[PDB]
Every structure is written in C-alpha cells, then in structure tokens.
Design a protein around this ligand. Structure first.
Ligand code: FAD
Length: 426
C-alpha cells in the first residue's frame, strides 16, 4: 500500500455531495492533487446532483457525523458563508401532530436540554415570531421555534469545493469522459474505471459516490432504492423579498415547507411526502440480466421534465397556506431531485465485498446534504482502513436487511408511471 502522496484515487460522482467532499478530504489529507481524478456525468457542481439546489435545511441532529458537520458549517472557512443561521419554525396542527410535537419538545426539555428552542402555544405567538404569516390560514396551529440551524446554500457550497479542487490541480473528467460504465477488474481487484466514451482510468482505489445512480451503475441487491422529491420556485419583488430577509425555515409536516428568498428574491417551496420511484428495466454492472429497478429520471438529461400534477397541487396548497398573498405567482423551475434510501436510512459506506479497492459511498437516504463538510473524512478513513468500527458496521454492505421501498418512511414510494404531469417529451 503506497503512502498518501503516492496513492491514486478515482472519485466517481465527484461533482456531487459525497463525491466532492471525498475529493476535498483526499486533498486536505495530503493526497497529491494530480493523483486524484474526479469523474462525473456533469461538471461540478453536477446539474443532476441532489446538492445542486438553492437551499437545504440544516437541523439540530445530535448524531456524531451531523455534529462534526455542524462545527464545520460554523467554523470552516470554505463552508461557513453558506450556512444561514435563520432557525426553523416547525408548525403543527390537528390533535395527532400537536401531540407528537409536544412530545418532541418535551424530549428536548428532558434529554439534551432545550435552551435554543421555544414552544409557541397559539396563532398569535407564532405571528409574533413570523408576522408574514396570515392568521386565518393557521387557525389551531402551534409550533416549535429552534434558533439553531437554518439553511445551507447547497449548490454554492459544492461550487466552492470545485473551485478549491481546481486550483489545487485535481484532475477532472466530465460527460462521456466522466460517465461511469464499469469498474476495471483484474482477478477480483478493482484497478480503475471505464467511462461511456471508452476512456480507461487506472488508480489504486475507486470510490462510487453516484448518489441515486449508484444502484443503476453496479448491482446493489435492492440495498438502495432511488426516489425523487419535488420543488418549485416563486419570484418576489425586491420589496416583497425584503419582508422575508433572515426569515426562518418554515415547515408543517401536513403541508410542506419554504425558505427565505435568495439574493435574487426567489423562494423555493417543497412538498412533504415519501418520494417517487421510477421503475424500469436496467442492467447494472454485476447483474446477469436486466432487472426492474428504480432508475432516476434526470432533470439534467430531460430539462423539459417538471413534477407530477399531484405535486403541483400540494405545492400550491403550501403557498396558499403559508403565503396566500402570493398565490397568483407562477411556480417555475419545477424539478425532481433524486436520492437513494436504504432500509434503515443509514448510509452505505463500505468496500465492495467482491471487488477489492472498489468502495461504495451512497445510501444518502434523503438527509445527507448537511454532512457535505465532513462526509469525505469518513470515506478517506474507509479507504485507509481506519474508519471507526461502529460506523463501519452501521454503514456496512447489507442486502436483505429490509425493504428500502418504504425504508423508515410512512409509506412505500409511489411510482412516476402512475403520477401524470411531469413528462413533456411528446
Ligand atoms: C432531492 C432532495 C434532497 C434533499 C432535500 C430536498 C430534496 C428535494 N432536502 C435536504 C435537506 O433539507 N437537508 C439535507 O441534509 N439533505 C437534504 N436532501 C438530501 C441531500 O440532497 C442528499 O442526501 C445528498 O445531496 C446526496 O448526496 P450524494 O452525493 O449521495 O448524491 P448527489 O449529490 O446527487 O451526487 C451523485 C453524483 O453522481 C453523479 N453521477 C451519476 N451517474 C454517474 C455516472 N454514471 N458516472 C459518474 N457520475 C455519475 C451525478 O451526476 C451526481 O453529481
């Protein structure tokens, strides 16, 4: 095994979240930049990466990886500017959701103290916190307000990683030169990657950080099932947008959520739901025949795609509830954004059980963007044989460990074949 300075690594999906972090941590660890090759279907930040977004939520997860990430969002100079500490307003209505939120709030008063969390026990208490809401839309609502967390400028953070890597001299391959087709195996040892255009890249170690595409590219035995979530955007005038400067993330699990406007006055609005699959026949490397698996329907490949009609209705209901004064604004740049769920919702970060020096770094399960600053550190540890055993176990190769179609969500994902309104191919 060579020294870090002499080790060649290929990061497949290095234009995405986990992949770009991996490349960053290899460089920060003293790998020689020109020995690191980032391969992606699309140039960093990849136009189909789940992290290519105006915003993501940063919550207050006590988990060690989430904690370490939070410290870097606060303190690391590459990342800090992209974390917006607006807090979060979690709204609840109906007996069931209110009971759940009260229990959750009590757990904070119990477990690791409250401190930065408030209970809002009426409409008027919510309005004092967020005067931009409309009373007649929030009848019977209560809320938890958390001063911790807020939102992350996701595409900008990945873009900042790519500029850093570029300036260090990392090597890149994109499009046909970056789209993984197969590992290169020599008697059960991975020694590189071949791309769609026929280019062959050789390295000591290969990381597959291909997000929702990972189970399409190599045989993962249904350990990961790929699903889409949805959003769209509305455009506020400068005067309208000023009202929502530093506004908290607003969330109601029965409705959806929205963010503070970006610097161009655009609000992104999301639904809350268990995700959509898109099953079709496909043959990943390592599969003996085509199989029915959920294959992302990429908005980058298909920019005329929007989102299902059902989704538009839900997002319109969210705007009508949270921002009734903006109900006549067009919802634009509608898109589907893909992730991959494991059965238990933990990551899949492990060496392949048959292909030595080929490593999986996926299973993001819809809540990994917030790990961008830290996650590559754990991937480097895996490559070097130093990942903490409890994490190695939690993130292990585990086919047959449960049904990832439902995962730890409320319901099995429905399928885009059954959800009209997104496809505008003709
Ligand atoms: C979709 C989504 C996700 C999301 C979210 C809202 C939506 C609508 N809200 C979040 C939130 O509030 N907080 C949070 O922490 N996470 C949230 N998420 C999830 C998050 O976006 C994902 O968990 C995370 O971004 C996933 O990272 P991962 O690195 O696994 O995936 P990726 O960024 O999509 O990157 C994968 C890359 O692989 C490349 N690719 C695909 N095929 C190939 C081939 N053949 N060859 C080479 N590269 C390939 C992609 O192009 C991509 O760059």
């Amino acid at each position: 095994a060579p020294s870090r300075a002499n080790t060649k690594v290929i990061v497949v999906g290095g234009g995405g979240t986990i992949g770009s972090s991996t490349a960053l941590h290899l460089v920060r660890s003293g790998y020689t930049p020109s020995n690191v090759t980032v391969l992606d279907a699309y140039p960093i930040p990849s136009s189909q990466s789940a992290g290519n977004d105006l915003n993501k939520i940063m919550d207050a997860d006590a988990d060690p990886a989430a904690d370490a990430a939070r410290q870097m969002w606060n303190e690391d100079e590459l990342f800090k500017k992209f974390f917006h500490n607006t807090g979060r307003l979690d709204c609840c209505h109906g007996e069931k959701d209110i009971a759940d939120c009260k229990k959750r709030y009590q757990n904070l008063v119990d477990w690791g103290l409250d401190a930065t969390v408030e209970w809002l026990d009426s409409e008027d208490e919510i309005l004092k916190r967020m005067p931009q809401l409309t009373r007649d839309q929030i009848k019977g609502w209560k809320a938890i307000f958390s001063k911790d967390g807020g939102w992350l400028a996701a595409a900008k953070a990945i873009k900042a990683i790519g500029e850093y890597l570029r300036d260090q001299g990392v090597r890149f391959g994109f499009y046909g030169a970056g789209s993984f087709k197969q590992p290169l195996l020599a008697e059960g040892v991975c020694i590189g990657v071949e791309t769609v255009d026929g280019t062959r890249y050789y390295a000591d170690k290969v990381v597959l950080a291909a997000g929702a595409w990972s189970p399409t590219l190599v045989e993962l035995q249904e350990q990961c099932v790929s699903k889409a979530w949805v959003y769209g955007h509305i455009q506020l005038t400068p005067e309208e947008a000023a009202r929502y400067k530093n506004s908290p993330v607003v969330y109601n699990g029965d409705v959806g959520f929205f963010f503070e406007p970006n610097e161009h006055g655009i609000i992104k609005v999301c639904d809350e739901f268990p995700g959509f699959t898109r099953f079709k026949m496909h043959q990943p490397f390592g599969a003996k025949a085509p199989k029915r698996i959920s294959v992302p329907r990429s908005h980058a490949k298909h920019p005329t795609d929007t989102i299902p009609d059902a989704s538009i209705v839900r997002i319109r209901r969210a705007i009508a509830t949270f921002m009734p004064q903006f109900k006549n604004k067009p919802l634009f740049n509608q898109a589907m954004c893909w992730c991959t769920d494991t059965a238990d919702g933990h990551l899949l970060i492990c060496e392949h059980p048959e292909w030595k020096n080929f490593y999986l770094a996926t299973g993001d399960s819809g809540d990994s963007f917030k790990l961008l600053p830290i996650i590559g550190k754990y991937v480097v540890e895996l490559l070097e044989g130093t990942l903490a055993d409890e994490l190695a176990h939690k993130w292990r190769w585990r086919p047959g460990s449960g049904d990832a179609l439902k995962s730890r969500r409320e319901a099995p994902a429905k399928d885009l074949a059954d959800m009209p309104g997104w496809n505008h191919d003709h």
